[PDB]
């Protein structure tokens, strides 16, 4: 009586990655990685510099340290710039051009039985919206997913460089994170779809009522039409309430995952301290990243949702 | 046609036939179960007037 959920259509992702020149996709991921590596190296240099300022009671040779720090930060910024330019100019634009060309050739070469079979609206929609989505939204969401996935990989790498026993903490939390991310990736889409579905009937019923206003008052059907309006609403809100507390659910779990990551990073760093091989710089660096990890986990989950939302357009 | 008034089969059939709607309802793919299109573009002007009369009578 119900339709089971389906695994992801990875062939669609690979067709998009074939639309974008996959060499250019590799370059774009490469510059995400270079951007993040230069960011994390900027903070490593900052750790070193501050340790120097700490052992020497005052700031020595400042200009050199500050110049190298600024160099690394600008390297991260320019890597981000080149990254986004590659994404758009080489990957997304090429893919949009290729997909629109392919679809026009196919649609035009189709036999007239195709146009007879399908409604024209269902073709115009794919030529307008499913193309606009791959034009802009899909490229942006892949950017915001890979940037953040690389960011999490590098925060975990820097924390594990400080205290390698943190991998043992991140693997259990990896399991929980994937479970939460999978549940959200599906129910968020379902509930968001239901909200968008149940929204329109309120306004459609309202236009209808405004059209038939005098007749409604005439038959004194006011109470019934008011009750229909309130049912339209309460149905929309019964689809909206989950659509928002879904985010609350998710974000709570991910912020526990982030708090447990902070606890793990801090306690393992303090165990290293007790072992006598910790410097204030390592704990500062590791723990700064551990404090940032929670919002990037949330970014990753929501960008998986957006990528799944916008990739059905490539499917269609 | 019912417009919120409880359905009685005999009176509904009587009203459908009294409005002479039967002929125009037979043309519907689902008859009285046919949904009128958005903004009412799925029915003729005189037919819509007859439907309004049907609602008024069935009331």
């Amino acid at each position: 009586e119900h339709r089971e959920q389906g695994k992801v259509k990875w062939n669609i992702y690979l067709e998009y990655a074939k639309a974008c020149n996959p060499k250019s996709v590799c370059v774009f991921i490469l510059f995400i990685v270079i951007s993040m590596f230069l960011s994390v190296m900027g903070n490593v240099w900052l750790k070193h510099w501050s340790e120097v300022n700490s052992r020497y009671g005052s700031n020595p040779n400042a200009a050199r340290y500050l110049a190298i720090y600024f160099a690394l930060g600008i390297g991260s910024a320019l890597a981000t710039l080149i990254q986004t330019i590659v994404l758009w100019v080489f990957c997304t634009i090429h893919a949009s051009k290729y997909l629109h060309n392919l679809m026009t050739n196919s649609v035009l070469r189709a036999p007239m039985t195709f146009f007879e079979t399908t409604p024209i609206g269902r073709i115009l929609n794919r030529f307008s919206n499913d193309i606009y989505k791959v034009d802009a939204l899909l490229g942006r969401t892949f950017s915001q997913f890979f940037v953040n996935a690389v960011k999490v990989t590098f925060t975990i790498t820097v924390i594990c460089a400080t205290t390698w026993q943190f991998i043992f903490i991140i693997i259990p939390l990896s399991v929980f994170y994937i479970y939460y991310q999978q549940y959200y990736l599906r129910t968020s889409r379902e509930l968001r779809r239901l909200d968008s579905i149940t929204r329109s009937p309120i306004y459609s019923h309202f236009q209808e009522t405004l059209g038939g206003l005098a007749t409604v008052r005439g038959y004194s059907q006011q109470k019934r039409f008011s009750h229909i309006n309130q049912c339209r609403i309460d149905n929309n809100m019964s689809a909206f309430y989950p659509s928002i507390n879904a985010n609350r659910w998710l974000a709570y779990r991910l912020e526990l995952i982030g708090s447990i990551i902070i606890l793990g990073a801090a306690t393992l760093s303090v165990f290293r301290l007790k072992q006598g091989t910790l410097t204030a710089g390592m704990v500062g660096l590791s723990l700064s990243y551990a404090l940032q990890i929670t919002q990037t986990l949330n970014w990753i989950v929501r960008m998986t949702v957006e990528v799944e939302t916008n990739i059905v357009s490539v499917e269609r | 046609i019912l417009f919120g008034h409880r359905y009685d089969a005999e009176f509904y059939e009587k009203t459908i036939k009294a409005c002479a709607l039967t002929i125009d309802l037979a043309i519907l793919m689902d008859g009285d179960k046919t949904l009128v299109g958005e903004k009412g573009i799925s029915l003729s002007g005189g037919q819509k007037a007859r439907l309004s009369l049907a609602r008024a009578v069935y009331a």
């Binding site: 236009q207 009522t209 659910w249 709570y252 447990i260 204030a280 | -």
Partner: protein, 397 residues
């Protein structure tokens, strides 16, 4: 024993002895499930298994019925109209639904306090590691630092994070419920007012406008409620940031604050460019869609003449030149804004460290540095969003 009793309160369901959709679990969830939002787990499972449909959704909680909310707000609206020379719907809605927004303000105050406690625990842990190592290197005199303090600072970071999360999401719960209340009530009041609206009045105000009252204006009040708490929790979250950052770095914090402030206008300028160029792209998209619409509606004659080749050429000219040049331009400004967002959180800290190093005789030590990065990260958000909050507020006005 107390842990066991706490578990036996929290986890156990209470059993019961001997086509409609089920009552909402927010009503049958103890305060711990209301805090961890773990009553959503059932609907999170159902949607993961099967494609949800309007029958799968639990009905609304106790006080979400649009009937109840509309009457609740209507009593106050009538009191306003019959009591005040200058009735204000704003104060009507406030009387009705501001209790939850005060409670959410309380939770937001706590969440900001804890959000700015976290850098202080970070500074304390770095300072503790520094002192602990500085003592052990001397050893390799009495009442020397215990390692326990490190673990208790770690556990205080966890406790701050956990209580932060709990209070934050009760803040969101309350503001989003209040947005749902305002929309569920103003929608019903708009309907019931139209049902008594005079014909001449409803003719003066178009039906498109009247349905935009419910389709747009109420959505902008609802979207206001999400942001209304930032009218003070942006200033609060900036004041305690500036104080923490001043007590940390000195007046060299002002360089960073200035950089963020002045990147705000440039950010808004680029945002205007972005929306402008997106709208331009949408209109080129509409142009290409008109071309496609004529091609498809004319497909029979088009295929008869085999004119599909030149019409393909025309479509592709429109796309490749107009739409794709516009989209590449949009991509380049996307690159510029991505560069800005990558660099500014860097540049703020780099510049304030430069001014610190050259102004202060203090050592720019680790405990000054990394809490400064954390605090600048926390400071970016309120400065970045006060514009959107005031925009939402004027739209709601």
């Amino acid at each position: 024993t107390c842990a066991s009793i706490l578990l036996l309160e929290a986890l156990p369901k209470k059993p019961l002895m001997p086509t409609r959709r089920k009552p909402n679990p927010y009503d049958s969830a103890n305060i711990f499930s209301r805090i961890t939002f773990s009553w959503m787990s059932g609907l999170m499972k159902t949607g993961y298994e099967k494609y949800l449909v309007e029958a799968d959704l639990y009905k609304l909680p106790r006080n979400f019925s649009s009937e109840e909310l509309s009457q609740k707000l209507e009593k106050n609206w009538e009191n306003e109209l019959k009591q005040k020379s200058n009735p204000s719907l704003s104060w009507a809605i406030c009387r009705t639904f501001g209790s939850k927004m005060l409670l959410a303000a309380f939770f937001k105050a706590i969440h900001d306090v804890l959000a700015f406690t976290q850098p202080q625990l970070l500074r304390i842990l770095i300072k503790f590691v520094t002192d602990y190592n500085s003592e052990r290197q001397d050893d390799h005199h009495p009442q020397k630092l215990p390692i326990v303090r490190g673990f208790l600072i770690a556990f205080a970071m966890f406790l701050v994070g956990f209580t932060q999360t709990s209070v934050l999401h009760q803040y969101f719960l309350n503001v989003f419920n209040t947005g749902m209340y305002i929309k569920s009530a103003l929608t019903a009041l708009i309907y019931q007012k139209s049902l008594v609206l005079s014909n001449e009045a409803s003719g003066l105000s178009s039906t498109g406008d009247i349905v935009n009252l419910m389709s747009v204006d109420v959505q902008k009040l609802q979207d206001l409620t999400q942001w209304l708490n930032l009218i003070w929790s942006g200033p609060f979250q900036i004041i305690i940031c500036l104080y923490s950052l001043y007590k940390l770095l000195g007046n060299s914090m002002w360089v960073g604050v200035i950089i963020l402030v002045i990147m705000m206008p440039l950010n808004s300028f680029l945002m205007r460019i972005q929306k402008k160029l997106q709208k331009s792209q949408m209109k080129y998209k509409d142009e290409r869609t008109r071309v496609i619409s004529e091609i498809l509606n004319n497909i029979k004659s088009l295929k008869l003449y085999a004119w599909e080749k030149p019409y393909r050429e025309k479509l592709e000219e429109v796309r490749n030149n107009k739409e794709l040049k516009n989209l590449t331009k949009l991509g380049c400004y996307m690159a510029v804004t991505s560069f800005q967002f990558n660099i500014v959180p860097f540049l703020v800290s780099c510049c304030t460290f430069a001014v610190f190093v050259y102004t202060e005789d203090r050592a720019l030590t680790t405990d000054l540095v990394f809490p400064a990065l954390t605090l600048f990260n926390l400071l970016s958000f309120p400065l970045m969003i006060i514009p959107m909050v005031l925009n939402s507020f004027i739209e709601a006005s």
